[PDB]
Amino acid sequence: GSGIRVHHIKRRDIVLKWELGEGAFGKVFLAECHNLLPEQDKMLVAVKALKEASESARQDFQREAELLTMLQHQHIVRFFGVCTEGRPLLMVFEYMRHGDLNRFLRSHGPDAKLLAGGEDVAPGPLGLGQLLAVASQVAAGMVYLAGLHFVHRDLATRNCLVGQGLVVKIGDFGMSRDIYSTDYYRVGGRTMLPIRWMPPESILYRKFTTESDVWSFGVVLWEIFTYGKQPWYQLSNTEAIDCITQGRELERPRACPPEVYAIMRGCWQREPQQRHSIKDVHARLQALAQAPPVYLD
Numbered sequence: 001g002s003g004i005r006v007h008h009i010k011r012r013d014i015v016l017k018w019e020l021g022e023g024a025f026g027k028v029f030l031a032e033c034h035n036l037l038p039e040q041d042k043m044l045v046a047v048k049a050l051k052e053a054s055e056s057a058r059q060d061f062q063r064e065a066e067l068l069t070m071l072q073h074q075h076i077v078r079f080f081g082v083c084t085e086g087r088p089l090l091m092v093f094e095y096m097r098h099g100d101l102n103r104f105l106r107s108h109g110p111d112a113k114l115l116a117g118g119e120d121v122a123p124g125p126l127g128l129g130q131l132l133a134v135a136s137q138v139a140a141g142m143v144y145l146a147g148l149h150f151v152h153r154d155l156a157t158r159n160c161l162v163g164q165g166l167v168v169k170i171g172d173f174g175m176s177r178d179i180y181s182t183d184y185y186r187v188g189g190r191t192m193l194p195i196r197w198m199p200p201e202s203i204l205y206r207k208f209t210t211e212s213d214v215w216s217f218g219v220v221l222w223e224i225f226t227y228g229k230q231p232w233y234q235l236s237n238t239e240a241i242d243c244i245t246q247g248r249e250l251e252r253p254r255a256c257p258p259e260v261y262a263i264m265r266g267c268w269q270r271e272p273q274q275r276h277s278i279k280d281v282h283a284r285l286q287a288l289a290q291a292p293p294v295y296l297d
């Protein structure tokens with residue numbers, strides 16, 4: 001009985017257009033939703049399918065739907081509601097035209113193998129003030145979630161989305177999409193963690209706290225200032241564990257001013273208690289975004 005009213009959607013108002021992608025045993029479609037909300041009579045959305053419909057996965061779904069319904073913020077991808085009328089079970093979010101932040105970073109790389117346009121952003125390397133803008137918006141999401149003592153255990157550019165005008169929001173939480181993803185380390189069976197993003201207290205004592213998140217967010221900045229590079233890409237899953245645990249730190253990115261590296265280094269304090277409040281990290285990134293310091297070669 002007692003719970004959050006989750007907006008349910010008729011299958012007739014949902015027209016699947018094509019696969020955007022496929023992960024977490026749940027394909028993601030572009031689709032058109034008719035009369036979802038009165039402002040637009042027909043409107044574009046992303047939709048998460050479910051590959052399995054077992055009663056211990058329909059439970060996963062109701063929790064996710066409930067939790068998603070409450071977690072409403074500027075920098076968290078709008079959730080419109082679900083659809084259980086037919087089968088496969090559907091979840092419906094706003095469409096983010098630039099897809100996941102990690103791809104988007106790699107495609108505004110210098111290393112980028114081809115040029116990617118769009119009407120709302122220059123091709124080629126992004127303005128430091130934009131890089132910071134991105135960071136700033138992820139930090140605004142993280143702050144909200146810390147607000148509700150929510151802990152995202154997989155903070156990474158891969159789990160963020162980029163929309164019209166370079167709006168950046170948090171887009172995924174649980175149920176890791178790519179099962180053959182190289183960022184995740186297989187520890188049991190059906191148990192994989194994004195080691196490279198994880199702080200020592202998490203690899204060692206398997207403890208995850210808003211501080212663990214802050215740590216993880218420092219790596220997100222690193223990813224953001226490397227146009228989506230995999231942290232410790234030269235190393236192996238065990239080598240990275242060694243590095244993190246020994247206390248080795250990620251090098252400064254070439255593109256990365258020392259004022260930001262500084263922020264990163266305060267996210268990576270070995271003492272969880274000695275890591276900067278996310279709120280303070282957000283503040284400084286917002287400030288820096290407002291007046292981007294100059295920095296060459």
Ligand SMILES: C[C@H]1CNC(=O)c2cnn3ccc(nc23)N[C@H](C)c2cc(F)ccc2O1
Binds near residue numbers: 171
């Ligand atoms: C299929 C990929 C790409 N998604 C979209 O391009 C895409 C565009 N808009 N949008 C909305 C939700 C959504 N994907 C998209 N959810 C999925 C599960 C998702 C979330 C992420 F944080 C990152 C990637 C991702 O799915």
